[PDB]
Amino acid sequence: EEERIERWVEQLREALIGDGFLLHYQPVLNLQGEPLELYQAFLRLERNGEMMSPNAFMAIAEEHDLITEIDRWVVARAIRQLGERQRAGHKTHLLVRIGPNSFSDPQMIDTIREQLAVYGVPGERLWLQTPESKVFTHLRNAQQFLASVSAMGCKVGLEQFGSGLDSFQLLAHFQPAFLKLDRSITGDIASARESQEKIREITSRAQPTGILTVAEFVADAQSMSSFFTAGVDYVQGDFVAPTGPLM
Numbered sequence: 001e002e003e004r005i006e007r008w009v010e011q012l013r014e015a016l017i018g019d020g021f022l023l024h025y026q027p028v029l030n031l032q033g034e035p036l037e038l039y040q041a042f043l044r045l046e047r048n049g050e051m052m053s054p055n056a057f058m059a060i061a062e063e064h065d066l067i068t069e070i071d072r073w074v075v076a077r078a079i080r081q082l083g084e085r086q087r088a089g090h091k092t093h094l095l096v097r098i099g100p101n102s103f104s105d106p107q108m109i110d111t112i113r114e115q116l117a118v119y120g121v122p123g124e125r126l127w128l129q130t131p132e133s134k135v136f137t138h139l140r141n142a143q144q145f146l147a148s149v150s151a152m153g154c155k156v157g158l159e160q161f162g163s164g165l166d167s168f169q170l171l172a173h174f175q176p177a178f179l180k181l182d183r184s185i186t187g188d189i190a191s192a193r194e195s196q197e198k199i200r201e202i203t204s205r206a207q208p209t210g211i212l213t214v215a216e217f218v219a220d221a222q223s224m225s226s227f228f229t230a231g232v233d234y235v236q237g238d239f240v241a242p243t244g245p246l247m
């Protein structure tokens with residue numbers, strides 16, 4: 001045990017150089033969103049001859065404090081693809097994950113600003129999501145971070161929102177551009193009752209501030225209609241379109 005990790009933590013620190021990392025994307029179709037090109041970005045690793053999923057190493061990168069490094073790698077990689085798909089005339093928008101330790105990371109704030117500029121990519125195309133739980137904690141930083149990146153026109157949103165009470169509490173203290181609905185509420189509206197009304201106490205509340213909304217993980221047409229009645233701007237999940245490397 002003392003060993004396997006040592007091989008992982010090394011190979012990772014390599015993909016952080018001349019990499020081995022790569023990104024798969026997932027279509028984010030919109031109903032109320034009417035209608036832009038958007039994909040959530042997902043990190044893949046080229047260990048040996050096959051492709052690794054963050055379920056194979058994110059744990060490691062955690063204890064060794066390499067997430068900041070990686071997630072800066074992810075964002076910079078997204079901003080590149082944005083330059084590429086834009087120099088090609090596509091105005092593709094990318095949803096990218098940012099951990100909590102990045103709210104204070106300047107190299108992040110600097111890697112966003114510089115790249116975003118060097119590719120002629122207007123920040124508006126870069127959407128950054130992160131759990132509300134991680135925000136309810138690393139707040140102060142996640143506070144100024146918002147401002148830092150938001151100034152460049154980027155969009156900062158919450159992932160897994162609506163779970164616990166304080167969910168609506170953070171709103172009056174934070175201020176996201178988009179809300180990725182928490183699965184504990186999403187996956188069940190076809191039957192679930194309180195949830196039916198739930199994504200309304202949320203939807204109808206976003207419309208005012210203009211806070212977009214994304215119900216992800218959708219896995220059936222039945223619930224697909226449900227979110228339209230709700231007024232959920234965007235939908236994501238294997239049922240709409242799985243994740244893939246292609247664009």
Ligand SMILES: Nc1nc2c(ncn2[C@@H]2O[C@@H]3COP(=O)(O)O[C@H]4[C@@H](O)[C@H](n5cnc6c(=O)[nH]c(N)nc65)O[C@@H]4COP(=O)(O)O[C@H]3[C@H]2O)c(=O)[nH]1
Pocket residue numbers: 041042043044053054055058071074097098099216217218236237238243
């Ligand atoms: N969020 C989301 N996922 C969907 C959906 N439909 C299918 N999935 C799949 O289910 C998995 C779980 O994603 P997760 O909860 O964010 O949990 C993720 C995440 O914690 C981590 N991860 C993967 N890529 C990245 C990345 O680029 N940045 C960061 N910070 N973490 C990543 O690895 C876990 C597994 O990722 P994957 O192998 O890519 O596998 C993903 C994804 O391919 C959907 O609508 N929404």
